[PDB]
Amino acid sequence: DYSNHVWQCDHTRVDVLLVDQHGEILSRPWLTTVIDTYSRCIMGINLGFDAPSSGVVALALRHAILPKRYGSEYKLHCEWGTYGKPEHFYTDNHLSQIGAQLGFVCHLRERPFKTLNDQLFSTLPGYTARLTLRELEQLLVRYIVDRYNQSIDARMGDQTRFERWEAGLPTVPVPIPERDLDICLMKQSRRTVQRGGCLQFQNLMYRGEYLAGYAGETVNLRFDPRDITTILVYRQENNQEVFLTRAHAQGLETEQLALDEAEAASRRLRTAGKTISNQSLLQEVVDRDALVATKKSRK
Amino acid sequence: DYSNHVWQCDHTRVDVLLVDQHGEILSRPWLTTVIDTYSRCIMGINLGFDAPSSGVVALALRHAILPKRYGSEYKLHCEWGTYGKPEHFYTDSNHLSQIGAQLGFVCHLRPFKTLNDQLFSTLPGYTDARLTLRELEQLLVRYIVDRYNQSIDARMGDQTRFERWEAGLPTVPVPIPERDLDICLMKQSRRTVQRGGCLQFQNLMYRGEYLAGYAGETVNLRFDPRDITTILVYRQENNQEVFLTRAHAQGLETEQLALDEAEAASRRLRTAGKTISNQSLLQEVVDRDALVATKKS
Amino acid sequence: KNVIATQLSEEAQVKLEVIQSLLEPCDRTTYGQKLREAAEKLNVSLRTVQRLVKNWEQDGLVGLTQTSRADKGKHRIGEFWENFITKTYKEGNKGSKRMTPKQVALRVEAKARELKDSKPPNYKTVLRVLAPILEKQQKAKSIRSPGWRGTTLSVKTREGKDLSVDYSNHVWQCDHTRVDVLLVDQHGEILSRPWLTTVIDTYSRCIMGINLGFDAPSSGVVALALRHAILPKRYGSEYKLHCEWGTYGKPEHFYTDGGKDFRSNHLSQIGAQLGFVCHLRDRPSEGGVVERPFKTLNDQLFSTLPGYTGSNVQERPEDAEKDARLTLRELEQLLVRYIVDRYNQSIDARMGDQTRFERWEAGLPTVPVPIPERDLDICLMKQSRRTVQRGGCLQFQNLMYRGEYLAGYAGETVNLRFDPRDITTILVYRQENNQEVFLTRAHAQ
Amino acid sequence: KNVIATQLSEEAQVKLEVIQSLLEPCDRTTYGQKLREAAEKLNVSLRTVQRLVKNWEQDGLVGLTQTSRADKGKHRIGEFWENFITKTYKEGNKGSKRMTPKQVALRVEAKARELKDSKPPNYKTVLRVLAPILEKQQKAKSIRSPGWRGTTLSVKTREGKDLSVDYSNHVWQCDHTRVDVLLVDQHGEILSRPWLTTVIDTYSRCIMGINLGFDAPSSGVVALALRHAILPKRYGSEYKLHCEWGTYGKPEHFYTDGGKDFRSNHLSQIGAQLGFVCHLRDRPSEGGVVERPFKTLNDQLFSTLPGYTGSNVQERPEDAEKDARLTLRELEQLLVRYIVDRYNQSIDARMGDQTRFERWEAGLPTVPVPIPERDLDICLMKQSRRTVQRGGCLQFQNLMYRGEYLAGYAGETVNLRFDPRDITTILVYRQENNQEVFLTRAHAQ
DNA sequence: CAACGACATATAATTAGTCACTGTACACGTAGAGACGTAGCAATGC
DNA sequence: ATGTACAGTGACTAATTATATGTCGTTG
DNA sequence: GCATTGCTACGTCT
DNA sequence: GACGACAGATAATTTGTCACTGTACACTACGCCTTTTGTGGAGA
DNA sequence: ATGTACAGTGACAAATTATCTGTCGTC
DNA sequence: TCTCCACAAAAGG
């Protein structure tokens, strides 16, 4: 009917092979896209190595619902005007939970992946190995915003997808504050808060306000894998978790960090550690065993 | 029909008020009985202070299925020769269903006045409480094996009810070994084993053969509350419990001991402990606190 | 010889639910119809439920739950590697050498590169292999002893016999401990932790008497404790006692460990004079009756006191030194009040209906006659053998003194009993038959 | 600010299913049908479902499950008894005293007797009231420290300033430990546990040098370890080293604790001569670069040795004295091979990509030229100040002395330096224009 | 023909006591060893 | 047959409140 | 006297 | 409607990975004390 | 902003047997 | 050539 209506979610295996910062190969990423029904507009996206599951569709839905602020590094001359909450969320134990928590109806039942592949993905060098996930998602955002939302679908009028979506709003939907969508984020269950209110997450130290008093306790973690520079701390009661604070990563060489980059750094450090030889240590332990074997007791 | 075809189990509260061996006034017991419906003959009884639950029904069924042997203290004239397993069983969670499946019969989840008239009314404390659990059980067993089972029913009366049961059995039933009835027994969990193969149960020490190697481990106890001199020890394997041995009580001054008697002994010891005054204890505590506070500097 | 199924596994619970329809007696046609109808209950074939009923018939309620795989608890690393790991742990933990699973994994890697095996067992695999051994060691280290029950009791001895305890003064136990309270002199300066020598009846578990002091366990300290436990008790108003320590009497036996103070010649003479035999204990746990109460004193009296050092150095507070405030006198008053008003009036654990003092008083075969102080003091006196020079003037520990009726036996070796606190006056005996009689005293002049 | 419902029960799951069935938009006439269908399938009234949907919309999935009652965590005994129990426990555990909850219950009983109260809180109630305090205390004592991350690092000094560690041989940490291994002399006889003085570079965590010996920590032992660290390391074939201990040079800062050997004027001499600025640590945790290697040495090397006494009395094996078989020389061989082959070759855990030795060598600002080992020995010499009389009559350490150039220089206080290992020959210096010069090796007679 | 407050009955969730069981310390045990700087004093040559 | 025994705990019961829950009556 | 040279002990730190 | 052969098919174990965390490193028992059992110097 | 790291562990993916589960066959 | 009276060493707690 009107714009904010049935939202469709589909899963696609993106055929652009990717590498990390240091060059080690990584599997082909997945794409999960939310798309409007009244328009053919891409509602929100999620690109990552994680296979289809409740978490990835939840993240894509959170992206679709929320207003989108993108940095100047994206070179976006057009702003993305997507926001709001749908009446239905036809997609595909957990998704119904967010459906009841936000108000929409989730269903476990014309995918736009073909044009994405034929206009953007084929151009990429690793099309089926020189692109990281960050560059892929930058190009994907470029294509979705500047080349897809601005595609006047003549079969659906002389107006473009974004303005067709905008004209279909009964009224401006008041955006949901981001906190009420932490249910859609990824979870780390048990995390020990250390002295001074710090957390050790993905081989990084995270510090946040109101956390010094929780030293020695255990807290939950809610994070967005696209940007783990800020993570959410939740304290577990009998049947609920309450927001506690935001934790920020320290010692970051760059202002932006994703889960993939942290995993890549950990992988590089682990490989560097494993590349160190061990023959000398084994010879030493063997010779110490031999030396203690020859020596006599007080008999 | 025939004998051992359908069994019915019903509960009642005996109007007799019972007391322990030390004289303390207890509550009124619960009587559970199993009846061979085709013969209306008493199958098994469970006389105790526990409210009717799955465990009491299981204990009554265990009494009914197994062959009956009673000591000379019961003063029995006839012998309770009724045994065998039923093809059906009627009684008032899933425990009974599991027991029936294990023992090979169907359990369905839905004669008190004739005992209350000529036995319970006669007995002391009916509706002066002077009878104990053991004495009341002895009287009930003597009455059942000597009068009710040896009685003649109002209809088709030509032989005793026990004789009607015996003639109505298509084939003599092969006895079920006692161990296979352990599913119906009372269960205690997480019982530690001590040095030499010993464990504590109802404030008593139980030495068990072939138990020394399990010292420091945890075992499960199965026991008959009517006779807790010998209890049965089981090993838990997170999916099943396997029999180990029979543990025997030590230091007992009597060859027979029931759960109620052990509970009464523990109650007597607890009361005798409680009558020990502790005014000196509290006075010493408060003056010690005063003395340490005096030295504070 | 039997198995009982527990924790019925709700999948296996509905499996039991279906197996109860096949149990009802029926003819072939409806039995097969309900077989097929129950096949769709759990979405299986008909051969599967045939096997189900066969297994339930064979094994009962335990056939409804899938049995564990036969490889559970075993390891696929090979028999050689398993034996190597176990033997390396066993030998590396022999004696004082302590060897962790990580060291076992390191040696596994060393042997693997020796044997050119490209897949050594992992450290996690080593931990999994060695977990049963550590678990059984922990179980062995946490063994509970049932202890004695009832009134019958005996104490094992190094000689191998069992010393029966049957009367209220048959066997007395005495042992030493260092009190966990740092004491203080009259000024406010730390002296030391005192020594607690306790005398306790074995039959009644009542505290016969105590010795609290700064002197180390010696024959004299054991003699002081024995004197306290034998003599009637009298305490002034400073001990705000509500009850009385109505405890006294000789023992017939004396049960102690192998300390030099208890194996001394002085203790032998003490026993031969007071008519009790001293005995040894093979293990310290055999003297548990005298050895547990120390803990009871720590958990109820010493832990409450301003100066307190804990059980060992691992639990010792850092505040113990600067929190020390109690003198020996105050600590001994508190201790005596605790024993008289709490410990002796407390219930004997095995009995459950009698206090320790009630058990002691009731169990006395006869009311013992109090022993005069002088006789007992003479009995517990250190003694040796010495002779007398010409004109008397017997010399003792670099001191000399003479009395009367001494020169007449110059050249005869005689016994010499004295108190090692007032050496100025000593007792000179004389063996004048097969009997030994009080010759005289040697007093300082 | 935000509340999320998790770990909801199976009943909560069926309620979630019914709320999902109740969420599809529809009309009053057909909405009410599924409303009463929800009431029937929940076997409750329709208004119960009305309340369910109301709380679900006003709270989310949190309102789906029943909220815990307000008395959860509250105590029905009363605020007065709450405060009395808490205050008694807090006061009785203040200082070296330790009051258990049982004693708090005893005091509660005594106070109730004094207050003529026939309903005091039970001991189980006292345990329940005091459980949060005990859990909070345990959590307080079990707090983990994040530690430093990355390459940047600073060490806090007792002076309050933060000293930056920037490159190799910038800050050196030296500390003493009592080795947990018993040693024997020739022919077999235990002597003691040796002292281990370790000096390690802070920027690289590489062990610069060690001193293992029975002599107690002292300015001399620190000087020996300093000489070992500064001088190039050469070891014979008896140490079956595979790698090379190529660590050497002089540091510019010396970060040690407040030990008397480290605050000594002898160490101040070493700093003034070689060019140190010795620093103190406010807390032991501020010297963790030098304490953790002790734990690593105990875990990986010292625990596998025959004569081993764990770093405790509680963890000490009973076989340590009888298992003690190694010598000081063999222990030094094993320790040096462990350091050269295993420790310095191991990964600096802070970085994770380079060895401690490789970090040390790569972090060198300029490759240093070693001391010719004679100037260094002179640098690590005990100093004093003596007066030369009668043309040279030095009497230092009650020994005669006379130099060759000491005749005329017999009226000035001469600086004196020496090595305590050999008092036979000494060194004498002047003090002219804030300078010094060597006169003669004043020999002994 | 369904939302919103009372309401007063009824579960039922929460705590306060009971009481048999069990782990575990009691078993001689850190204030002492050793070193170093800072006072006092004494031997002692002028 | 047997070490000792007390502090703390687990499982259960009883007392104690705090909401859940099926009507009555107003509200659109 | 008066200044060195030895002691001993005591506080303090590990 | 009972069983066994016989061949994929689940799925239940073990095995290995790696990020995270608990906790010991912070000088610490072999020494103190006692008592018997030689063995050897002052005296008779 | 920051004590120091190593044994040990939780959660999980990968590898590997081992019972399981459908079909035929003969009852 | 015995008796006092020191030492030291072994062995328990």
Residue numbers in the entry:
A (entry chain DP1): 196 to 287, 295 to 311, 321 to 339, 354 to 524
B (entry chain CP1): 196 to 287, 294 to 311, 323 to 339, 353 to 522
C (entry chain AP1), D (entry chain BP1): 31 to 475
Text lifted from the article:
CRISPR-associated transposons (CASTs) are mobile genetic elements that co-opted CRISPR-Cas systems for RNA-guided transposition.
To comprehend how shTnsB facilitates RNA-guided transposition in the CAST V-K system, we determine the structure of the shTnsB-DNA complex captured after the strand-transfer reaction by single-particle cryo-EM at 2.46 Å resolution. The structure reveals an entangled architecture of the shTnsB protein around the DNA building a pseudo-symmetrical assembly in which the four subunits of shTnsB can be grouped in two different conformations. Thus, shTnsB1 accomplishes DNA recognition in the LTR(8) end, and its DDE domain catalyses the attack of the 3´OH in the LTR(6) branch on the target DNA, promoting the strand-transfer reaction. E321 is 6 Å away, as the structure is captured in the post-catalytic state. The distances of the extra density to D205, D287 and the backbone phosphates suggest that the density could be assigned to the H2O molecule generated after the 3′-OH attack of one of the strands of the transposable element to the target DNA.
